[PDB]
């Protein structure tokens, strides 16, 4: 199916956003 | 010719009977019961739903106990149910899958059934062994059995496709009396509460009253419109009701020798498969081909209520001896009990 | 990579702690801001910029220039904000797919619950074909309910939650629900083929077998995938498909069900046209109602794999299973519970006893 | 032929029927209405019944 | 009492005409589909023609297609069957039959040996 | 007390249920047929049980016992003045309020009675066997077209007709009824899922 692929793509996008913003805030 | 004179003597005699019937005619039951208040809007809730059959149900009959009932289905089964607990007390397989009538002797001992096969199978219930086998097979009829009723544990009256209605003897297994002269296939019959006379309805729009002791018909009521399918006795031994394939019920009287009331609306075009009375004879329940059965006022010709809970055509309907509930079996292999 | 960045930041903090502030000249501030160690008083202080970010990894040799005065105070042009610092050397489609598939799943949930209630609240409609249908609607509901708990969990985790075993079990539940739905769509097709393909079978045994293959088998390949993923990769709440093989474990069975389901569809429609032979508009109306029940729209993009799919093809691909499947529940519901003539006739006869 | 025999027995039955007496409709109708009220309170279908003695809940 | 009394018949030379009116009494007329059945000497009963309640799809047998014509009158409760161009072989006892079920397009036993809804019509001779 | 007798009744009920379940399996696993135009005739076709019933000794009047055959897979209808009666018999059985859901199979076992046989033309889509003259073939197709005109006149109940020819031995006719019964059952399933 593609539901998991969308979840992985969404997860990776949120993960990259969390990493960038977190260190910047720190 | 001499035959034309025989036909002449018949038509002139019929005219004399019709004149005598119109002579004794007076203010009918319609206008002499105007002061009688209506029965009132009554409801009928489906308390039980006896399921377990496979094919369409065709007949049923209560017992003296008024708690056990027997039903017959076209799948070749004859199940005796317990209306109080809804438990199948017995399930007898039929040697012929086509069964159109089932009876319950007034002793909880024997059970009769018939159908396309001209043989009428009587089964014993209180057998010494666990199995319930065939006690006797009444044969001799030349037409399909349409309705059979039990007079006692020794005699049984049956109706067949042939006009001849025969009163059998279970012990000797041979016909004792053969009532004839209907000219049509007798669809059903009704035993009077006194077990001296019984009426029968055929497909010639006529109802004949026969005495069990003799073989001569006492009267003849011909005021219907088409073939009569159901007939039941009034619970006083003095009148009865009939139903034909015209959505028209007729209440005939024995002493009057003519109809008393006609029950039919102007928005229903169907037949009447079953007819029965209440314990007091005030409520007249009749099933139709419109997937539901109705209940009329026997003294006001007004629709008392409508019982609509079946998903197919109602084929059998019967009231208990004490009139506590109404069991109706339709072609959806479902037998409900209304109370 | 995000978790590695956090560990790297902690390592930098530990290294900074191991360095004491005492110096011959007055030292400058030493905190974690890009960790800044003790600088040189009256000289340019440089520090290695981090590389945990994609934009920062392209400049690994970059240095953060600072001006630590001799008085141990950083150059601050103004005191209205934090200290001054000079740093010059160191998408929407997912949101669109989110808003379009979440609204469709909600509508399906509303239409499915009412559809199941109608079929369950009618005692005179209980039949094997409806029993499989009711379980089919229950499977769709469990699917819709699961995805709702899923996306909200992802937002909660990204907005502790990762290390907790709850998130892992939630994703397994979704993998099991989506797998059960596809396999229950299969048992529906194999049952329809059993009806058409003349074969005398016992209703009780063949029925409990359809329920077993629909509910039990999902556990035969989703649990192995769970234990395999756990031992190998468990940090990402079983959300990262590092190795395609593991994702293939839970995907191959689904692809098989869809493939063996399309075969039944072409077989069923073949009998329809054969029967109609003894017109195209009627056949068109028949396939439009047979497609949602069997979920054959997946065959449009089936052999294509995520590893191969790239570029906008992924968007076009992910637009099918996120719109049809999201609205597939509505189709199967209205077609077989509202548009069906039988259920309607039952409403016509009950309107009298209910008024 | 044999149909004349059906005619003879037919008229004979008609003659037998024409011999029985009859009762006025206003009399048989009144007796029917009178009996219908003697057991008015004994009909569980006409009058309601509490769930205590009713064997069907 | 349902009864069907008809008239007409008698003797007529071949090729002539004849009109038979079946006066129906004892039942509502505009609810059943009336039919005509004949019994030739030495043969069984056969179907001739029919007509709906009000009359919209009138049908005849192949032997009488175009010769005979059937018409009814719901106001007078009558059923007519006009004859044109008689045939020496058309001699038979034309009965008046009423279908048993109202509001139905079909009806069985119309040609049965015994039928309680028949009129016992007169013999109609066509010879010289 | 009443507890003991209640379980005895409950155990009895459970026994009937266990028996009725197997009875329902054998009942649904077989098909019933009617032959007109009661004697039982049972036979199997590829492990498929068939129960053909032939009405016998019943009177001519059939407007009542014919209703008991409502839930039948197919009603085999054979034919032979001599045919106009059979034509009306099928006509009356076709558009009946009770037999509207029951299909009918036709097993066809002159110019004087029917005048349409003069200006009638053989359909071009016919399959005339070269072993006989076109006279008889045009006759069978005329009777077939006549029966069809009566069949397709009104299909409210949605029941189909299957006209066949008696060109083979009986062993081949059993295969036909088997194929027709399968077709009727399949069409019913197709309409049970709202595909047709």
Q: Which residue from C307, C270, C304 is spatially nearest to C286, judged by alpha carbons?
A: C270
What are the phi and psi torsion angles at D17 (to 5°)? -70, -35
Chain B residue numbers touching C127 (CB-CB < 8 A): none
CB within 8 Å: B236 and D32 = yes
Burial of C120 (0-12, 13-18, 19+ CB in 10 A): middle
**Which long-range CB contacts under 8 A does E45-48 form with residues at least 24 apart?**
E45/E95, E45/E111, E45/E112, E45/E113, E46/E111, E46/F81, E46/F84, E46/F85, E47/E110, E47/E111, E47/F84, E47/F85, E47/F88, E48/E81, E48/E94
Q: Using an 8 Å Cβ cutoff, are C288 and C332 in contact?
A: no
Q: Which residue from E13, E58, E10 is spatially nearest to E36, judged by alpha carbons?
A: E58
Nearest-angstrom CA–CA distance, F86 and F80: 8
Q: Using an 8 Å Cβ cutoff, are B33 and D37 in contact?
A: no
Q: Which of B50, B51, B54, B86 to mutate to test the interface with F (most CBs of F within 10 A)?
A: B54
C226 Cβ contact list (under 8 Å, min separation 6): C168, C172, C175, C238
Q: Which residue from C115, C112, C220 is spatially nearest to C176, judged by alpha carbons?
A: C220
Q: Which residue from B92, B101, B119, B90 is spatially nearest to B58, judged by alpha carbons?
A: B101
- Give the count of alpha carbons within 13 A of C326, CB side only: 21
What is the signed CA dihedral for B16, B17, B18, B23, rounded to 10 degrees? Answer: 90
Is F33-192 a CATH 1.10.357.10 domain?
no
Domain segments of chain F as ranges: 33-192
Indicate the helix (H) or strand (E) that contains B135: strand B134-138
F41 Cβ contact list (under 8 Å, min separation 6): F35, F51, F52, F53, F54
**For chain C, how far is it from start to end, CA to CA, in angstroms?**
65
Q: How far is CA C267 from CA B18, C197, C278, C282, in A?
A: 71, 10, 18, 17
How many whole angstroms from its chain centre is CA C45? 48
Place of tokens 């086998």: B133
- Three-state secondary-structure class, residue E118: strand
Q: Which residue from C98, C116, C82, C74 is spatially nearest to C326, judged by alpha carbons?
A: C98
What are the phi and psi torsion angles at F123 (to 5°)? -65, 140
For F60, the closest of E43, E104, E113 (CB atoms) is E113
* Tokens representing residue B103 in the block: 């009876």
Interface residue F135 vs chain B (CB under 8 A): no
Q: Which residues on neighbouring strands pair with residue B330, listed in sequence order? A: B314
Interface residue B164 vs chain F (CB under 8 A): no
Total structural domains within chain B = 1
Q: Which of C241, C297, C328 to mutate to test the interface with A (most CBs of A within 10 A)?
A: C241
C120 Cβ contact list (under 8 Å, min separation 6): C134
Nearest-angstrom CA–CA distance, C76 and C68: 10
Indicate the helix (H) or strand (E) that contains C8: helix C2-18
Nearest-angstrom CA–CA distance, F173 and F176: 5
Give DSSP secondary structure letters for C11-40: HHHHHHHHS----SSPP---EE--EE----
E89 Cβ contact list (under 8 Å, min separation 6): E126
3-state SS of chain E: helix, strand, coil percent to 5?
A: 5, 40, 55
Chain C segment 187-246 residues within 8 A of F by beta carbon are: 192, 195-196, 198, 200, 202-204
Strand runs (DSSP E) across E9-122, as ranges?
Answer: 10-11, 17-25, 34-39, 45-50, 59-60, 69-73, 78-84, 92-98
DSSP E122: P
Q: Which of D2, D25, D37 to mutate to test the interface with B (most CBs of B within 10 A)?
A: D25
Q: Which residues on neighbouring strands pair with residue C31, listed in sequence order? A: C36
Q: Using an 8 Å Cβ cutoff, are E91 and E126 in contact?
A: yes
**For chain A, how far is it from start to end, CA to CA, in angstroms?**
39
Q: Which residues on neighbouring strands pair with residue E25, listed in sequence order? A: E3
Q: Which CATH number fits domain E3-126: 2.60.40.10, 1.10.275.30, 2.60.34.10, 3.40.50.720?
A: 2.60.40.10
Chain E residue numbers touching F58 (CB-CB < 8 A): none
CB within 8 Å: C317 and A3 = no
A26 Cβ contact list (under 8 Å, min separation 6): C9, C32, C33, C34
Q: Count how many pairs of residues, chain B against chain F, have C-beta atoms within 8 Å.
A: 75
Q: Using an 8 Å Cβ cutoff, are B259 and B250 in contact?
A: yes
* Tokens representing residue C270 in the block: 């073949």
Kindly list the partner chains of chain F, i.e. chains with 3 or more CB atom pairs below 8 Å.
B, C, E
Work out whether the CA dihedral F97, F100, F102, F107 comes out positive or negative. positive
Work out whether the CA dihedral C259, C264, C265, C267 comes out positive or negative. positive
CB within 8 Å: B183 and E28 = no
Strand runs (DSSP E) across C261-355, as ranges?
Answer: none
Nearest-angstrom CA–CA distance, B199 and B261: 18
Q: Which of F64, F96, F97 to mutate to test the interface with B (most CBs of B within 10 A)?
A: F64
Work out whether the CA dihedral F77, F82, F88, F89 comes out positive or negative. negative
Q: Which residues on neighbouring strands pair with residue B134, listed in sequence order? A: B123
For F115, the closest of E65, E101, E107 (CB atoms) is E65
What is the signed CA dihedral for C85, C87, C92, C94, rounded to 10 degrees? Answer: -90
Interface residue B98 vs chain F (CB under 8 A): yes
Indicate the helix (H) or strand (E) that contains A19: helix A3-25
What are the phi and psi torsion angles at C16 (to 5°)? -65, -40
Identify the closest residue of chain F to C198 by CA–CA distance: F182
Nearest-angstrom CA–CA distance, C87 and C77: 15
B236 Cβ contact list (under 8 Å, min separation 6): B193, B281, D32, D35
Nearest-angstrom CA–CA distance, B135 and B147: 19
Q: What angle do CA F30, F32, F38 make, to 5 degrees?
A: 130
CB within 8 Å: B205 and E28 = no
Q: How far is CA B145 from CA B58, B188, C97, C241, C340, in A?
A: 12, 9, 71, 76, 41
Strand runs (DSSP E) across F100-175, as ranges?
Answer: 103-108, 161-165
**Interaxial angle between packed helices C244-276 and C281-294, expressed in degrees from 0 to 180 and rounded to the nearest 10:** 150
Q: Which residue from B209, B197, B16, B200 is spatially nearest to D19, judged by alpha carbons?
A: B16
Q: Which residue from B91, B92, B100 is spatially nearest to B73, judged by alpha carbons?
A: B100
Name the structure determination technique: cryo-EM
The yes-or-no reply on F/B contact (3 CB pairs or more, < 8 Å) is: yes
F30-36/F74-78 β-pairing: parallel
Nearest-angstrom CA–CA distance, B140 and B137: 10
Burial of D48 (0-12, 13-18, 19+ CB in 10 A): exposed
Burial of B179 (0-12, 13-18, 19+ CB in 10 A): buried
CB within 8 Å: B308 and C124 = no
**Residue C349 structural domain:** 91-355
What are the phi and psi torsion angles at B63 (to 5°)? -130, 175
Q: Which residues on neighbouring strands pair with residue B163, listed in sequence order? A: none
Q: How far is CA C255 from CA C172, C186, C249, C259, C303, in A?
A: 18, 11, 11, 6, 8
Q: Using an 8 Å Cβ cutoff, are B124 and B133 in contact?
A: yes
Q: Return left, alpha or beta for E8; rule: phi > 0 is left, psi -120 to 50 is alpha, else beta.
A: left
Work out whether the CA dihedral D18, D23, D24, D29 comes out positive or negative. negative
Exposure b/e, B12-38, CB count within 10 A at least 16 = b: ebbeebeebbeebeeebbeebbeeeee
- Give the count of alpha carbons within 13 A of C179, CB side only: 25
Interface residue B93 vs chain F (CB under 8 A): yes
What are the phi and psi torsion angles at B22 (to 5°)? -70, -25
Nearest-angstrom CA–CA distance, F28 and F10: 26
* Number of other CB atoms surrounding residue F117 within 10 Å: 16
* Tokens representing residue B204 in the block: 């010639």
How many whole angstroms from its chain centre is CA C219? 18
Chain E residue numbers touching F61 (CB-CB < 8 A): 108-109, 112, 114-115
Nearest-angstrom CA–CA distance, F102 and F96: 10
Chain E residue numbers touching F62 (CB-CB < 8 A): 108-109
Q: What angle do CA D16, D19, D24 make, to 5 degrees?
A: 130
E123-125/B197-202 β-pairing: unpaired
Q: Helical H runs in C159-237?
A: 165-196, 203-215, 217-232
Q: What angle do CA B111, B46, D38 make, to 5 degrees?
A: 75
* Number of other CB atoms surrounding residue B104 within 10 Å: 24
- As a whole number of angstroms, the longest Cα–Cα distance in chain D is 69
Place of tokens 């089932």: B102
Q: Using an 8 Å Cβ cutoff, are E51 and E34 in contact?
A: yes
Q: Which residue from C332, C200, C186 is spatially nearest to C264, judged by alpha carbons?
A: C186
Q: Return left, alpha or beta for B86; rule: phi > 0 is left, psi -120 to 50 is alpha, else beta.
A: left
DSSP C74: B
Chain C residue numbers touching B268 (CB-CB < 8 A): none
- Three-state secondary-structure class, residue C123: helix
Identify the closest residue of chain D to B21 by CA–CA distance: D22
Q: Which residues on neighbouring strands pair with residue B307, listed in sequence order? A: B293
Q: Which of E36, E47, E62, E112 to mutate to test the interface with F (most CBs of F within 10 A)?
A: E62
DSSP F66: G
**For chain D, how far is it from start to end, CA to CA, in angstroms?**
65
**For chain B, how far is it from start to end, CA to CA, in angstroms?**
62
Nearest-angstrom CA–CA distance, F186 and C203: 17
Q: Which residue from C253, C104, C89, C83 is spatially nearest to C185, judged by alpha carbons?
A: C253
What are the phi and psi torsion angles at C55 (to 5°)? -75, -25
Q: Using an 8 Å Cβ cutoff, are B64 and B321 in contact?
A: yes
Interface residue D43 vs chain B (CB under 8 A): yes
Chain F segment 153-182 residues within 8 A of E by beta carbon are: 154
Total structural domains within chain C = 1
Give DSSP secondary structure letters for F3-47: HHHHHHHHHHHHHHHHHHHHHHHHHHTEEEEEEE--EEEEEESSS
Identify the closest residue of chain B to E122 by CA–CA distance: B4
Burial of F181 (0-12, 13-18, 19+ CB in 10 A): buried
For F193, the closest of C192, C202, C204 (CB atoms) is C192
Work out whether the CA dihedral B14, B19, B20, B21 comes out positive or negative. positive
Nearest-angstrom CA–CA distance, B61 and B101: 9
Identify the closest residue of chain B to D7 by CA–CA distance: B6
Q: Could you tell me how many residues make up chain E? A: 128
The alpha carbons of chain B give a radius of gyration, in whole angstroms, of 20
* Tokens representing residue B126 in the block: 């209180």
């Amino acid at each position: 199916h593609s539901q998991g692929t969308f979840t992985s793509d969404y997860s990776k996008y949120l993960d990259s956003r969390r990493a960038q913003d977190f260190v910047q805030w720190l | 010719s001499e035959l034309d004179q025989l036909r002449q003597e018949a038509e002139q005699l019929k005219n004399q009977i019709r004149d005598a019937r119109k002579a004794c005619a007076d203010a009918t039951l319609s206008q002499i019961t105007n002061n009688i208040d209506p029965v009132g809007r009554i409801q009928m809730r489906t308390r039980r739903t006896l399921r377990g059959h496979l094919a369409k149900i065709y007949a049923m009959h209560w017992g003296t106990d008024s708690r056990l009932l027997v039903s017959a289905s076209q799948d070749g089964k004859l199940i005796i149910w317990d209306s109080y607990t809804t438990n199948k007390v017995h399930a007898i397989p039929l040697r012929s899958s086509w069964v159109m009538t089932c009876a319950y002797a007034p002793s909880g001992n024997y059970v009769a059934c018939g159908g396309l096969d001209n043989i009428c199978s009587i089964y014993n219930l209180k057998t010494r062994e666990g199995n319930v086998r065939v006690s006797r097979e009444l044969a001799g009829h030349t037409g399909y059995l349409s309705c059979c009723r039990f007079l006692d544990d020794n005699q049984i009256v049956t109706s067949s496709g042939d006009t001849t209605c025969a009163l059998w003897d279970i012990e000797t297994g041979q016909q004792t009396t053969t009532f004839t002269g209907h000219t049509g296939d007798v669809m059903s019959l009704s035993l009077a509460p006194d077990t001296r006379l019984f009426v029968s309805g055929a497909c010639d729009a006529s109802a004949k009253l026969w005495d069990v002791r003799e073989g001569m018909c006492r009267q003849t009521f011909t005021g219907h419109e088409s073939d009569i399918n159901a007939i039941c006795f009034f619970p006083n031994g003095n009148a009865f009701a009939t139903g034909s394939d015209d959505a028209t019920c007729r209440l005939f009287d024995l002493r009057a020798d003519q109809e008393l009331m006609t029950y039919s609306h102007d928005n229903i075009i169907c037949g009447i498969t079953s007819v029965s009375f209440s314990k007091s004879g005030r409520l007249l329940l009749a099933g139709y081909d419109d997937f539901n059965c109705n209940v009329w006022d026997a003294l006001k010709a007004d629709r008392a209520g409508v019982l609509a809970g079946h998903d197919n055509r109602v084929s059998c309907l019967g009231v208990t001896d004490d009139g506590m509930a109404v069991a109706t079996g339709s072609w959806d292999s479902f037998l409900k009990i209304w109370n | 990579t995000v978790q590695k960045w956090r560990e790297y930041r902690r390592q930098c903090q530990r290294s900074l702690t191991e360095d004491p502030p005492p110096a011959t000249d007055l030292f400058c501030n030493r905190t974690f801001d890009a960790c800044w160690p003790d600088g040189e008083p009256g000289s340019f202080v440089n520090v290695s910029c981090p590389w945990y970010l994609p934009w920062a990894s392209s400049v690994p040799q970059g240095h953060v220039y600072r001006f630590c005065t001799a008085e141990g105070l950083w150059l601050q042009k103004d005191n209205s904000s934090l200290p001054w610092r000079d740093l010059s050397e160191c998408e929407e489609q997912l949101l669109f797919l989110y808003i379009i598939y979440t609204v469709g799943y909600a509508l399906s949930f509303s239409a499915l619950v009412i559809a199941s209630a109608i079929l369950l609240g009618f005692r005179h409609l209980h039949c094997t074909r409806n029993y499989i249908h009711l379980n089919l609607f229950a499977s769709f509901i469990l699917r819709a309910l699961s995805v709702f708990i899923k996306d909200a969990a992802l937002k909660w985790m990204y907005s502790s939650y990762q290390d907790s075993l709850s998130c892992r079990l939630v994703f397994l539940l979704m993998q099991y629900c989506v797998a059960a739905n596809y396999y229950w769509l299969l048992v529906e097709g194999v049952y329809l083929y059993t009806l058409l393909a003349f074969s005398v079978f016992s209703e009780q045994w063949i029925f409990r077998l359809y329920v077993s293959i629909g509910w039990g088998v999902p556990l035969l390949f989703v649990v192995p995938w769970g234990i395999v993923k756990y031992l190998y990769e468990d940090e990402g709440c079983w959300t990262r498909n590092s190795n395609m093989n593991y994702w293939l474990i839970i995907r191959l069975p689904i692809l098989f069900a869809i493939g063996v389901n399309f075969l039944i569809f072409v077989r069923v429609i073949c009998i329809v046209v054969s029967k109609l032979k003894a017109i195209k508009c009627r056949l068109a109306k028949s396939t439009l109602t047979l497609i949602p029940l069997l979920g054959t729209h997946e065959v449009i993009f089936a052999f294509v794999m995520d590893e191969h799919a790239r570029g906008t093809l992924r968007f076009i691909k992910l637009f099918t299973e996120l719109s049809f499947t999201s609205f597939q529940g509505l189709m199967v519901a209205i077609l077989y519970c509202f548009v069906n003539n039988e259920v309607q006739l039952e409403f016509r006869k009950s309107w009298e006893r209910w008024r | 032929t044999a149909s004349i025999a059906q005619a003879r027995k037919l008229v004979e039955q008609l003659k037998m029927e024409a011999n029985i007496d009859r009762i006025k409709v206003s009399k048989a109708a009144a007796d029917l209405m009178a009996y219908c009220e003697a057991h008015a309170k004994e009909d569980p279908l006409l009058t309601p019944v509490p769930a205590s003695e009713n064997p069907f809940r | 009492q349902v009864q069907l009394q008809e008239s007409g018949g008698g003797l007529v030379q071949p090729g002539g005409s004849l009109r038979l009116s079946c006066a129906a009494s004892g039942f509502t007329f505009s609810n059943y589909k009336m039919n005509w059945v004949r019994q030739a000497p030495g043969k069984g009963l056969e179907w001739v023609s029919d007509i709906s309640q009000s009359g919209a799809s009138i049908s005849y047998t192949g032997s009488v297609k175009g010769r005979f014509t059937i018409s009814r009158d719901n106001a007078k409760n009558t059923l007519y069957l006009q004859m044109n161009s008689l045939k020496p072989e058309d001699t038979a006892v034309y009965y008046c039959a009423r279908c048993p079920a109202p509001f139905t397009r079909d009806c069985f036993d119309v040609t049965s040996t015994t039928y309680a809804y028949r009129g016992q019509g007169t013999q109609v001779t066509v010879s010289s | 007390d009443q507890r003991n007798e209640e379980k005895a009744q409950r155990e009895a009920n459970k026994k009937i249920e266990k028996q009725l379940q197997k009875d329902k399996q054998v009942y649904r696993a077989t098909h019933r047929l009617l032959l007109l135009g009661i004697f039982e005739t049972k036979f199997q076709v590829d492990k498929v049980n068939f129960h053909m019933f032939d009405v016998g000794a019943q009177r001519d009047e059939r407007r009542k016992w014919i209703q008991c055959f409502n839930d039948v897979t197919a009603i085999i209808f054979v034919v032979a003045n001599r045919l106009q009666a059979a034509l009306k018999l099928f006509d009356s059985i076709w558009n009946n309020k009770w037999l509207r859901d029951t299909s009918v199979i036709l097993f066809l076992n002159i110019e004087d009675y029917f005048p349409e046989f003069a200006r009638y033309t053989t359909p071009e889509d016919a399959t005339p066997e070269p072993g006989e003259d076109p006279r008889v073939t045009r006759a069978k197709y005329f009777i077939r077209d006549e029966f069809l005109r009566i069949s397709t006149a009104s299909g409210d109940g949605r029941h189909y007709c299957y006209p066949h020819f008696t060109c083979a031995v009986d062993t081949e006719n059993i295969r036909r009824v088997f194929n027709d019964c399968r077709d009727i059952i399949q069409r019913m399933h197709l309409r049970q899922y709202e595909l047709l």
